[PDB]
């Protein structure tokens, strides 16, 4: 038996995982059949924290839990209502584990947008109807902080659509302080931000359709205005005013339009802010020290650090985060080499220059932990594969004493590794994502032991031996003098003597990685196993983790290089002995959707059919934070020409020579329906025949259980039809 589409849609072959919760530096929390267990890493004993069946009288059921750091109380999140990528409202209660009851006095509002404990204690801080509150005690009331909240206008402490997606990457604009004195927050103003207006039809029980309105800033439009405040939660009584100080960005960024990137807390008297320009090729870090005499968060030109990029933009997406020591007088950051290779650079808090602790022909993916002795980071240096990820450990005293704590544990089963160092970096948990069955291993920083390995996906391995599974081949093709990376889900019992069909699964977005070493039971695993279709992937110009020269190649010309080298990559695959030159397709989603539609309109002839899901049509149709980072401004001064020289509706007459699926959900908050339905309108205006499929009130993911099944079943039918496969 093969790996059927039903095996994928219903996920019968489960991939078990292990999720941690580090409270101290030797204790973490787990969950077992709805039971909250506390593990002591040092030994191997495990004490319970809360038993199953304790869950009752909680609306419907619990979908998250937040033990306060002091482990006195605990939060019970329920009544979950998704919004955007990370936005969600909920209803919360609090459980006093000591008193063994539930607090019923001064309850938490329904429709809470965000909450978080304090770094130490039970100082609860939540946001409700765009407005901040501080409930220092579970049985006490809420001291309101902001009173200016207004839906679609003023956002206090949470993020608006464009911040939550393309800048902060979470609903959270609340940052407490180490010891629980300062609650820093942010105020967003989408007042003059244009509003996109799509329709929503909901259940059958709605005679008239609602119309959703989102403060969405497209390319060249007006953006939200940020203000960064810091509240002294010490002077917080009912009969007293709320003390706060606005740290405005440095004048090298306040000159025009700007964004706020991140808020890092060094010491209790030292906050570290990261402000970037609208062009995202000028970033600055302002470190501001408190002053008990004035009560002001003052900054100086000594604590200001600039980071720009002439080759393109700053960082990978949002710029790189600063990693501050405990002494606070020196931090570590991933900035880009003069050769264009991002590595860890040691910065002094009052010294403008830098000193690189790592460098090479690779790229540091991200810093993970910093101890008075070592420094831990993950990188693709192992075996020189950019598609790999392994944990290292550099020494501050010797920048030549770095050791790979994960490289050669199981270098066949484990080439993709994630981490979770303890509070004081005493114990780290490694995550083997691929290319073998995922392995979840516990580790000790000192003895370098494997202690108690939790998961091995024994359930997966047993079931997968009674099934035929495809193979993954990773290799390199040479384009433009450099060596790019490609990947292929070769079908079971692959024989080069037979000519196979191709599926060019494509993303190739800015700083992308489709060529990885991860275990993924995907749609391709069905297409390769049962229907015997070679599914390939390629990471050419524009991809990341490989070199800024490669990444900042597509800069200010989207729809050109990423598209073009996808055509040459399939042509080189078609010169291989196992590719039906007449049976090759291209299927995409998001940037893979935009590229697929540009590839298909390229008149290359290499491709015959082509599915696209939520595809970008014109770039003047996307949020400015993203589109202006790469494409620039849609004005004649900046890059109007290359904006119009890249719309999919320009490459339409060539669509007459190919088949084309255009899938999209009606209620798309991101890649709006606007793009798909205007690409369609140009296609109809040309005489191009194409099929489509809308998905009712589906988001950008088309992720309702019956719509997800539908989209892969419907795409499978278009694919097998075009491939003349029974």
């Amino acid at each position: 038996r093969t790996y059927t589409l039903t095996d994928y849609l219903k996920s019968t072959f489960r991939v078990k995982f292990y999720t941690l919760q580090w409270i101290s530096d030797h204790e973490y929390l787990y969950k077992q059949e709805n039971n909250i267990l506390l593990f002591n890493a040092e030994y191997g004993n495990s004490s319970i924290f809360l038993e199953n069946s304790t869950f009752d009288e909680l609306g419907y059921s619990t979908n998250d839990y937040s033990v306060s750091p002091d482990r006195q109380f605990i939060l019970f999140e329920y009544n979950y209502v998704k919004q955007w990528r990370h936005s969600y409202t909920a209803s919360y209660d609090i459980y006093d584990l000591n008193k063994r009851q539930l607090i019923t006095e001064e309850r938490i509002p329904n429709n809470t947008q965000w909450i978080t404990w304090s770094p130490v204690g039970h100082k609860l801080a939540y946001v409700w109807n765009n407005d901040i509150y501080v409930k220092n005690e579970p049985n006490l009331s809420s001291q309101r902080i902001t009173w200016t909240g207004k839906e679609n206008v003023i956002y206090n402490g949470v993020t608006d659509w464009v911040y939550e997606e393309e800048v902060f990457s979470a609903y959270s604009a609340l940052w407490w302080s180490p010891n629980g004195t300062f609650l820093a927050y942010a105020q967003f103003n989408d007042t003059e931000v244009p509003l996109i207006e799509y329709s929503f039809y909901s259940d059958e029980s709605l005679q008239y359709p609602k119309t959703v309105r989102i403060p969405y800033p497209k390319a060249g439009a007006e953006n939200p205005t940020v203000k960064f405040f810091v509240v002294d939660t010490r002077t917080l009584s009912p009969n007293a005013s709320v003390t706060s100080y606005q740290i405005v960005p440095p004048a090298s960024v306040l000159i025009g339009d700007h964004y706020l990137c991140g808020v890092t807390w060094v010491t209790e008297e030292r906050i570290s802010l990261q402000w970037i320009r609208r062009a995202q090729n000028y970033s600055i870090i302002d470190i501001c020290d408190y002053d008990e005499s004035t009560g002001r968060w003052i900054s100086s030109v000594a604590r200001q650090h600039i980071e720009i990029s002439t080759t393109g933009w700053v960082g990978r997406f949002r710029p790189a985060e600063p990693h501050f020591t405990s002494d606070g007088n020196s931090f570590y950051k991933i900035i880009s080499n003069e050769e264009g290779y991002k590595h860890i650079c040691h910065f002094q808090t009052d010294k403008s220059n830098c000193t690189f602790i790592t460098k090479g022909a690779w790229e540091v993916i991200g810093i993970e932990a910093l101890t008075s002795d070592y420094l831990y980071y993950i990188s693709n240096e192992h075996k020189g594969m950019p598609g790999g990820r392994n944990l290292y450990r550099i020494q501050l005293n010797d920048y030549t004493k770095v050791t790979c704590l994960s490289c050669e544990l199981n270098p066949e089963r484990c080439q993709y590794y994630s981490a979770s160092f303890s509070n004081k970096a005493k114990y780290y948990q490694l995550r083997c994502f691929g290319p073998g069955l995922p392995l979840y291993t516990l580790h000790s920083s000192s003895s370098d032991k494997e202690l108690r390995v939790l998961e091995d996906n024994s359930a997966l391995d047993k079931m997968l031996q009674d099934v035929q599974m495809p193979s993954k081949k990773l290799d390199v093709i040479n384009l433009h003098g450099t060596k790019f990376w490609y990947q292929m889900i070769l079908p079971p019992h692959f024989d080069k003597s037979k000519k196979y069909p191709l599926l060019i699964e494509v993303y190739a977005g800015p700083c992308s990685q489709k060529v990885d070493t991860v275990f993924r039971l995907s749609w391709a695993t069905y297409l390769a196993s049962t229907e015997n279709i070679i599914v390939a992937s390629f990471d050419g110009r524009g991809s990341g983790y490989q070199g800024d020269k490669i990444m900042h190649a597509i800069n200010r010309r989207l729809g050109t290089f990423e598209v073009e080298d996808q055509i040459e990559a399939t042509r080189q695959f078609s010169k291989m002995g196992f590719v039906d030159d007449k049976r090759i397709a291209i299927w995409g989603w998001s940037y893979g959707g935009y590229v697929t539609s540009m590839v298909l309109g390229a008149g290359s002839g290499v491709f015959k059919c082509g599915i696209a899901v939520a595809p970008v049509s014109k770039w003047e149709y996307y949020d400015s934070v993203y589109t202006e980072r790469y494409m620039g401004l849609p004005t004649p001064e900046d890059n109007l020409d290359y904006y119009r020289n890249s719309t999919v509706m320009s490459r339409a007459e060539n669509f007459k020579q190919v088949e084309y699926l255009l899938i999209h959900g009606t209620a798309d908050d991101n890649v709006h329906f606007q793009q798909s339905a205007q690409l369609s309108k140009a296609l109809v205006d040309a005489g191009v025949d194409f099929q489509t499929m809308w998905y009712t009130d589906e988001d950008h993911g088309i992720a309702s259980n019956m719509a997800h099944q539908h989209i892969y079943t419907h795409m499978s039918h278009f694919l097998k039809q075009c491939f003349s496969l029974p």
């Binding site: 977005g509 998001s590 935009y594 890649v671 950008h700 993911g701």
Partner: peptide
């Protein structure tokens, strides 16, 4: 741009 819900 911006991929589906992770993978």
């Amino acid at each position: 741009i911006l991929a589906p819900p992770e993978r």
